[PDB]
Design a binder for these strands. Structure first.
Ligand SMILES: [Mg+2]
Ligand SMILES: [Mg+2]
Ligand SMILES: [Mg+2]
Ligand SMILES: [Mg+2]
Ligand SMILES: [Mg+2]
Ligand SMILES: [Mg+2]
Ligand SMILES: [Mg+2]
Ligand SMILES: [Mg+2]
Ligand SMILES: [Mg+2]
Ligand SMILES: [Mg+2]
Ligand SMILES: [Mg+2]
Lengths: 63, 76, 71, 50
RNA sequence: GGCAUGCUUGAGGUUCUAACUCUGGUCCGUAAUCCGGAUCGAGGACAGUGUAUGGUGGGCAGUUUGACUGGGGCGGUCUCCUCCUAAAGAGUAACGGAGGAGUACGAAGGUGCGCUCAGACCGGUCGGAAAUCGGUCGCAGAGUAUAAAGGCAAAAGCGCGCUUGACUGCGAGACAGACACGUCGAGCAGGUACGAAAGUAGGUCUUAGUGAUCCGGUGGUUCUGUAUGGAAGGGCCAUCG
RNA sequence: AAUGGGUCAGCGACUUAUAUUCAGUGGCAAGCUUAACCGUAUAGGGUAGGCGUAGCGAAAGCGAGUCUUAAUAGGGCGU
């Protein structure tokens, strides 16, 4: 196949049958500042936004 | 000496005017220290933010001594 | 890993659903060892699963609808 | 405001993390807080995060 | 304690010749003195040469040196907070006018119980325009850890007693918003602190006090662990530069 | 009072190949289709392999559900 994907976006974005999962950000290396209401609302695994679907689905070769 | 440096305009104001219909936990007023007081069925959160607790219609009535502004929600 | 729907158990011959029997038909790839069976409809006939391990709902269908689950 | 750890009393490796001005108050603290492993309150004491 | 001398070996000193060296002598190949070979002479385990490593090295090479800018150079400015410009909803520019932050606090947090300001004035020993005391008048002109704005008698201001809710798993619904980030939160389940009990408590009157990812560092965790049984290395959780 | 061109006649600028996505029109249909290579060779054989018919989870794993959690409580994703 003459269509190579990008290796970074294949590690940042797992794919399920309900969109693209991704881990949240900002949670590393300075954590004694933040509030517990803010920490546990960044622990989950969200799904990608509609403005960002057609950008990533060209980086991942899905077009 | 030189002076630019403004800030980024926190978007305050009053939402949900005098005849609306509200849900359980909507935001009524994004206050900056109690222009409006906690009326009958509203909340008054951490930074003095009025929010609902029950359903109905917003009132905006002036009550009592000190002439203070009470935002109550009426089951009507 | 692979898995077989309960509806596709009628798609083999001989009524002995071995591990090589599913490779005899094209219902499974080569180089596949561990296989499950999950509930995805009616079975169709009377078979004998062996070598493969079904779920909770599939085993309650095959043992009820005239089959047998041995090893 | 140097930052410190608060290792639990019981055998769990659960800890809290806060800061403490080492300049004015030299000695430790024995604050009784919750523990998510034994599911009850115990007392903590530690410093020296490294 | 140390001697007796070996077993060895490191490091320093002297001497010897047999390695290597001679851009020394005269024979031979040769009709040549390049190159060899033979033989005396000198130096001699040094010099020199491989390979591993320090130092010096514009001798030489590949390259880097931001933007806004009433031309660009000089100077000033790059992020966050409050007011004005801003036209009585939000938003909104200028090298437009004015100011602040890159933190404190184990009580300056929670709770129950109490209590009122500044200032003026009269009297009162060393103070005197002023200190502490008593009195009337007050009607927040004081105070708020920290700038200004908006607030504060259920005082959000002041004192006392006990304490750790500066809790863990969550979170319907909304506000904002290109995105990444943000802000408020009823209620439910755990286990708590005060109060006789209703009840209050998921930090501080609110809004500034901060920096992604990648790498590494430390605590918990069979979730995997390249024939097998373990380990190393990962993964997830918590947390550092 | 910015650029270009003295006129004529010839030539002179969105292509191809391999992968993939969306629409138009067709074949068979819980199934559709073969690549090399064989072949009396545009037929025919070749179903290896691919995409589907089921997901959730970092993973083991469990499955019309599963993950987080002390919870079988809520909530995310799915039919
Ligand atoms: Mg982490
Ligand atoms: Mg196959
Ligand atoms: Mg010379
Ligand atoms: Mg140079
Ligand atoms: Mg420039
Ligand atoms: Mg306005
Ligand atoms: Mg207007
Ligand atoms: Mg205070
Ligand atoms: Mg009181
Ligand atoms: Mg092994
Ligand atoms: Mg011309």
């Amino acid at each position: 196949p003459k269509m190579k994907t990008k290796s970074g976006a294949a590690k940042r974005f797992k794919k399920t049958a309900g969109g693209l999962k991704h881990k949240h950000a900002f949670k590393s290396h300075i954590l004694t500042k933040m509030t517990t209401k803010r920490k546990r609302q960044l622990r989950g695994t969200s799904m990608l936004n509609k403005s960002d679907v057609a950008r990533v689905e060209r980086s991942l070769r899905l077009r | 000496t030189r002076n630019g440096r403004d800030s980024e305009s926190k978007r305050l104001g009053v939402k949900l005017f005098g005849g609306q219909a509200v849900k359980a936990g909507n935001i009524l007023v994004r206050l900056r220290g109690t222009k409006f007081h906690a009326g009958y069925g509203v909340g008054l959160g951490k930074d003095h933010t009025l929010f609902a607790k029950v359903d109905g219609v917003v009132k905006f009535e002036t009550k009592g001594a000190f002439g203070r502004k009470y935002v109550s929600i009426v089951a009507a | 890993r692979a898995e077989v729907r309960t509806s596709e158990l009628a798609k083999v011959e001989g009524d002995v659903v071995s591990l090589q029997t599913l490779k005899d038909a094209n219902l499974i790839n080569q180089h596949v060892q561990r296989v499950k069976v999950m509930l995805s409809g009616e079975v169709g006939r009377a078979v004998t699963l062996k070598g493969i391990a079904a779920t909770k709902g599939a085993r309650a269908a095959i043992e009820a609808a005239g089959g047998k689950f041995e090893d | 405001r140097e930052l410190i750890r608060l290792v639990s009393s019981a055998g769990t490796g659960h800890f809290y993390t806060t800061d403490k001005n080492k300049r004015t108050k030299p000695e430790k603290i024995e604050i009784k807080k919750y523990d998510p492993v034994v599911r009850q309150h115990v007392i903590y004491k530690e410093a020296k995060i490294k």
